[PDB]
Design an enzyme around this catalytic site. Structure first.
Site, short mmCIF file in Angstrom:
data_model
loop_
_atom_site.label_atom_id
_atom_site.label_comp_id
_atom_site.label_asym_id
_atom_site.label_seq_id
_atom_site.Cartn_x
_atom_site.Cartn_y
_atom_site.Cartn_z
N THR A 1 -27.74 -17.54 -21.73
CA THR A 1 -27.93 -16.02 -21.87
C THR A 1 -29.15 -15.65 -21.14
O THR A 1 -30.08 -16.46 -21.03
CB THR A 1 -28.00 -15.63 -23.33
OG1 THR A 1 -29.11 -16.20 -24.02
CG2 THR A 1 -26.71 -16.01 -24.03
N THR A 2 -29.16 -14.42 -20.62
CA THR A 2 -30.28 -13.91 -19.87
C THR A 2 -30.26 -12.41 -19.97
O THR A 2 -29.22 -11.71 -19.88
CB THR A 2 -30.28 -14.41 -18.41
OG1 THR A 2 -31.47 -14.10 -17.75
CG2 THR A 2 -29.01 -13.95 -17.65
N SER A 131 -32.53 -18.26 -21.51
CA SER A 131 -32.65 -19.57 -20.84
C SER A 131 -31.95 -19.48 -19.45
O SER A 131 -31.96 -20.49 -18.75
CB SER A 131 -32.01 -20.71 -21.68
OG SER A 131 -32.57 -20.82 -22.98
#
EC number: 3.4.25.1
Lengths: 202, 242, 242, 242, 202, 202, 242, 242, 202
Positions: A1-2, A131
């Site tokens: 996920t970002t 991450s």
């Protein structure tokens, strides 16, 4: 996920990936990640899917309650700090999400980066969270001018999640971009954006 | 003398409890508010004239946001209204938390009616000596009154406070269910005029509305209210001639 | 004197609770409700006539679906109704939550009585001065009255509220246990009509029922209601020629 | 005179509780209930007539199963009776739960005495208004009375309520320590007819019983009741001749 | 284990496997994993049997209670929000069932997934949940039109589940299909459903 | 431990194993494993012996309270559902037992099986939770019919726990079976049962 | 009256809370405290008079720092006032904890109204016998008055305390909506010179303020007090010859 | 008057409270205690008069110790003082816990007076009826009078008790803010001698004092009271001749 | 992840390294991880951004509270002792943190070290604390004199952490120094600091 964030001088633009991947396992297909706190205010979450939706609805409700009490719209700071406070109270529950809460208020444009142990901090530059974050920060800081449109701003946020994606198996597509232009609250939504990243191919 | 109003827990032999019939009297001594329903939304209109010019001209408030699509007005003590309106706002917003749907006018009213009735039964706490008006459009435009008893009454048009009795009789003649939005706001602006026996100046009335088409609460700006008020003045003056 | 009447804990030299006795009279002040049982189901007829034309004629509702197959009328204060019924609604479902089976008409009516029994023994509170009629068919048809006291009495046709006295006398001669569903419906509106001593209109009264071929609460629209109210009106006329 | 029925935290100067004596005079303001112990069983009869003929035969209907071998009838407030009876039923199953021992007739009455004495001593609540006849065969026949306050007294025939005094006086002549089941059933029917000053019909009383030989509750059936009406009424006619 | 939800032109169809096997345990072949919440709302459970049923009973009691009290029908959104709050608060007694609540309501037709960790996301018109999910997405999308009929949909639902059960050595032979065509709430149930895939030889 | 249950053409018959161990002693030498819950209501249990012993005492008592309170004998559906709540509570104590609660009631004949986390479920056919359940299901379906008598039912039930005897370490010869026909509540007990497994011979 | 004034729970048949009017006469027992609002800032002028000369006047003060741009004054019990305002200090600080942003003058007023309301509602406790004047600048200058029950009135020239009635008359005439911060400072000392009924010495007065430009609290030291008082005295003497 | 003095939750129609006035009469009833502040310290004197010789010649304790540099002395209800000072002692220790710094007399007085006010709020709890004169040096010497009403007042010289009024009139003439440490204690001894209207012996006074130069409370022996006692005795003699 | 602190002779000088990273998200690198408690008080934290800013908020609110309620500026020890007591309350979740609270008061200049689980102990003119602690001692103590002014002290702190930076691997680029000389409360931030250290390292 970002999740990515940037401050333009015509508005605040943040972005998400709505199809988050474990590594090869997915259970989303239109799974929500972008929450409309107001016409000027947004909550963009990276993390668990579920904990973020539960936390988002608490916050949405109190943002409105607060508008109504002071007869004066919340600041971006005020909603960021509210979430920091809630996160510590519910640390005796297992709710883990790292947040980016941004928008426009009368003091200007700003973003607050929140971790699930608390904290809200002012960044008026580049911010990214998750991450896919390390890859994302690399693209974004260099190609940041603070004197950039909200038109040329979406192309860069796109680019950032996109680079993360081709070196992560944890981030997938679903790429949504939100723009808060100080007239409206526009969500481009996956469909169009998948075609902007189509042309960053051939 | 009675002592059938020593506590709220003593009925009168006639079978009534006197103490909530005196909390009913608490509303009357406070100033007027009128809620006026048409078929294109609802209007809510309330006193702001209060006292001389020592008090701020735009003094806050009788016309409260509940939501950004449900509004309320009060009459009675604006102490008992102020904490009650705090309680109201939370109550609508809890509905929004657990349903992700806005509270319907009827359902918010039912919850205020229970809340009031909690205080009414125990002798250890008095009920509010306040009445509330709940105006919305859920998707049917609606107007209610919630009593200090915590009783629920549906209204086509309603009023409370000092001018309660004048506005009633007045709407007995003129009001229709097919009044336009424009007509229904204006009609109640004559009635409001009659309630204080004076011409309406735009700085002593606060008026909000919930429209059916938008379903969004909006407050009428002083000078945007001015032409609606101006058309009312003709009829209010006329009628104060008699 | 007389009483010994300003406490709820006190039994007077009569051996009555005066407090409680004042509250059965507070039922009467509330609007009439007419309950009638037949062998084809149970019809409940309820007064929804309040106010002139200040208020809307539809005023909630007053014949609340409590459960799937049980409905109830209220007489007494509307404020008192709201809270007793909130709790009543919850209790109906509570039985289904822990057994996953029908709630009994007997059992619902006892625990609606129980909530207020709590408020009759205890000293910190008053019972609500409200009498609900509890009508349904779990598996045979039944009609009860719940009393502000907390008494539970099975009726076969009855009235309570304003019309209490009036309708008993009426039903001494008229009420029979070989009556039809249709005959019962009509006879129940005549009873109500007698209570108000006036001509009916089908727009300000609501009739609902639980049949035994359904086992579900149903409600009879106002478009449907018209012929039943009309055959009622002849019989009100005969009575109001005497 | 007094003003010590105003509390229940007090004693009067004669060392009495007048509150408890008017909860006693609530029992006397309820329809009678009679118990008979014979040495072949124990038989509890209680009125089942109430109100006008527009109330079911089966409107209270007092003689509740509490346990398998224990039935208990009531006189007083039909509202307080219900809660007590439910508390009596729960206490008997708690005994079963914690011992697997069906509760003694005596020990059940004791636990009821203690329960009603919490409500006598505390001033934030009131004493019950109800007297119960707790009755069964644990392993010998027993009939007790638990009072408004909760005083335990053992009887071999009793009554409680409005009928009480006449039926006491009657037993003082007729009742014999040599009594049998058939005679007893007849005897209590005679006794019920003096209270009401009028004949009995089959369904206007309910009778429950615990035999020694079964050591289990069975309700007397209406049809089984019928031959007992006919024989009882013989003596009834004679004693209502003035 | 697996569950699917697709939205038709005139309905909503969801499906469950009605026999649940785990290792080589069979606890009944007539067990419930299908809940009728209201008239034209259903709930379809994926995950473990026993937490589905326990949680389920409660949602039904709420569903009636909210209808009665408001005088109007609960939406899919009303109960979707409702389940997610109930799951988040009870983390003293968590539940490991993955819901898909769907049906026809006043807003139209839509199906929300509620995670076993809580939170209500909405899926636009296709959704698969469970282990059988990855393959199931592609099974539904193959013939998918949103103007697919209820009749062609019920058929379509069966192939997505039919891929999941035969592939696993710990899935059941039972299947339940739920049809909601507004003029019916049909429960197809194992016998009728079997003969649809009797064409597919297994 | 395993249970079986089957519904007859005029009653219900349920059965359990006997000759099991708990600690280092035999836990069945005249012990109850079928408890009479109400008049024509029973519970057979597979699991922890003494937790199942304790739970029977509670449920038994609450069944009588329903009867004594409401003047109406309890339905099977009532009782099982109430078990489900209690099991939900008792996750913080040892209390793992797999329960079938069957008998005759107003709706007719039925058996509801209650999971270890709780969840009642209708079965109008055969049911068996247990560990011997799959093998039992083998044997059970073979002579099950909806015109199976109450004395053709006792043969069947014995057959299955005898095939499961060799597959478990908790099952010996002479076992409990019970018939509940509404005009009988007759418990055969081991002696009779040896004679019913001597018609197979072994 | 003479009974419906013996508790905070009772209403009168005029629907007055006399316990709350009485808590308000408590305000009038205390010394005068005066607020002016102007558009360049807001002014707080407190009486800091000592009645004997063995008193030390540093703690006869009204003026309490609350927030770093919110000051407030008090009139009522000294006791009531310190506990109340300490609540308000915490409340202003709490608001900064969960939002990271100083409290608005309005929100603080709503919170402290609501604190006083639970104490007006609950019968087991008396209300705070105090009113506040809450003066600050949040972004736009503010002046509030809270009533003993928790009612809220926004002002523009105000006082509470002994001299209130006369200060109300004074600002009717003198206070204009164009007074500069300097000009209005003197005018507010002329209002204090009038009510105290003699000319003022800087030792018997204390001034605190919030201006818009500085958006800070300061407190006026007796050196910085004098030029203003000197101007003020000239006119205070002239109004003592009218 | 009536009914305004039988509870603590009621005000009078004038904003006075007659219950709380009577607690001030409670302060006035008991023995005098004088506190006199100087620029070198603060001297706290309390009468150690005994109304018999059977009473110990050092009666525990007319001057209590709260902290190492903080003492207080009592007038009014001596019962109450034991409780009240235990609280004061724990409060100064609590601040040494949570800030590692002793409590300032001003903030201590506020805390103690708040605990009093809390006991004013409740209807079943009456306030302490005792005044304490808390004395200490934190940076400059400080003297406070704490009242039963919860209100604090700072002084330059003070008295409480039955001698209160006499010593205000006395020190008003005589006190100046330029006494030395010795001159201060002597003038305070004169004040005690005036109030009781007899000469002093070291046996009818207990003196402690607080030095700036030591920042500590020290407790004066009867031997070293002798020089001060003799010097003072001359002035007292002259005052009791006129 | 290191802090130092030293008394000047005319102020308190403290310094903090910017970088806190958790996973692939850098929390601080460009943003505040030093907080203002009061005007004349600062607090530097060695440890996580979330825990530090949420706890600091508390210390800040009771710092403004102390000042308002008692109309007297707080001592250093008061605040110090107060933070210690707080760390006792929450000790069930990570709150372990290395704190220096200092600045100015009436009795002079002071800095106090709060141990991670509670307690507060004092340091005459040199403290460290942090993971770079050993390295920082050599630097601060060497270049200390008893006549040390504010000017060369802000430089001295930069050298101590940046020398630490090499013995660590946790610690990365950027530093904030704060100077509380009593006449100004300046947060130097990386840009000024790096340019001062351009002579003392190159």
């Amino acid at each position: 996920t970002t999740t990515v964030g940037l401050v333009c001088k015509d508005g605040v633009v943040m972005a998400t990936e709505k199809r988050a991947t474990m590594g090869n396992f997915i259970a989303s297909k239109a799974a929500k990640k972008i929450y409309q706190i107001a016409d000027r205010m947004a909550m963009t979450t990276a993390g668990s899917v579920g904990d973020a939706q539960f936390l988002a609805r608490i916050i949405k409700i109190e943002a409105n309650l607060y508008e109504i009490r002071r007869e004066r719209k919340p600041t971006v700071r005020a909603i960021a700090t509210l979430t920091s406070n809630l996160l510590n109270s519910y640390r005796y529950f297992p709710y883990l999400v790292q947040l980016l809460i941004g928008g426009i208020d009368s003091e200007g444009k700003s973003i607050y980066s929140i971790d699930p142990i608390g904290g809200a901090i002012e960044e008026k530059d580049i911010v990214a969270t998750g991450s896919g974050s390390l890859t994302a920060y690399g693209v974004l800081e260099d190609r940041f001018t603070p004197e950039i449109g909200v038109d040329e701003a979406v192309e860069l946020a796109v680019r950032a999640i996109y680079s993360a994606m081709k070196r992560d198996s944890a981030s997938g597509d679903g790429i949504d971009v939100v723009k808060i232009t100080e007239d409206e609250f526009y969500q481009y939504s996956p469909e169009e954006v998948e075609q902007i990243l189509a042309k960053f191919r051939k | 003398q009675m002592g059938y109003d020593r506590a709220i827990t003593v009925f009168s032999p006639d079978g009534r409890l006197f103490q909530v019939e005196y909390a009913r009297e608490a509303v009357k001594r406070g100033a007027t508010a009128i809620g006026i329903k048409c078929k294109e939304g609802v209007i809510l209109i309330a006193d702001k004239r209060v006292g001389s010019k020592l008090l701020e001209a735009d003094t806050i408030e009788k016309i409260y946001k509940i939501d950004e699509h449900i509004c309320a007005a009060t009459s009675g003590l604006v102490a008992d209204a102020r904490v009650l309106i705090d309680r109201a706002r939370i109550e609508a917003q809890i509905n929004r938390l657990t349903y992700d749907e806005p509270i319907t006018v009827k359902e918010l009213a039912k919850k205020i009616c229970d809340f009031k009735q909690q205080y009414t039964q125990y002798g250890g706490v008095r009920p509010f000596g306040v009445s509330l008006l709940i105006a919305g459009v859920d998707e049917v435009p609606k107007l209610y009154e919630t009593d200090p008893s915590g009783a629920l009454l549906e209204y086509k048009a309603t009023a409370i406070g000092m001018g309660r009795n004048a506005v009633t009789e007045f709407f007995e003649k003129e009001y229709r269910d097919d009044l336009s939005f424009d007509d229904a706001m204006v009609l109640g602006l004559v009635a409001m005029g009659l309630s204080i026996e004076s011409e309406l100046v735009p700085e002593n009335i606060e008026v909000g509305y919930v429209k059916v088409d938008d379903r969004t609460f909006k407050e009428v700006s002083p000078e945007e209210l001015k032409p609606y008020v101006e058309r009312a003045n003709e009829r209010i003056r006329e009628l104060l001639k008699k």
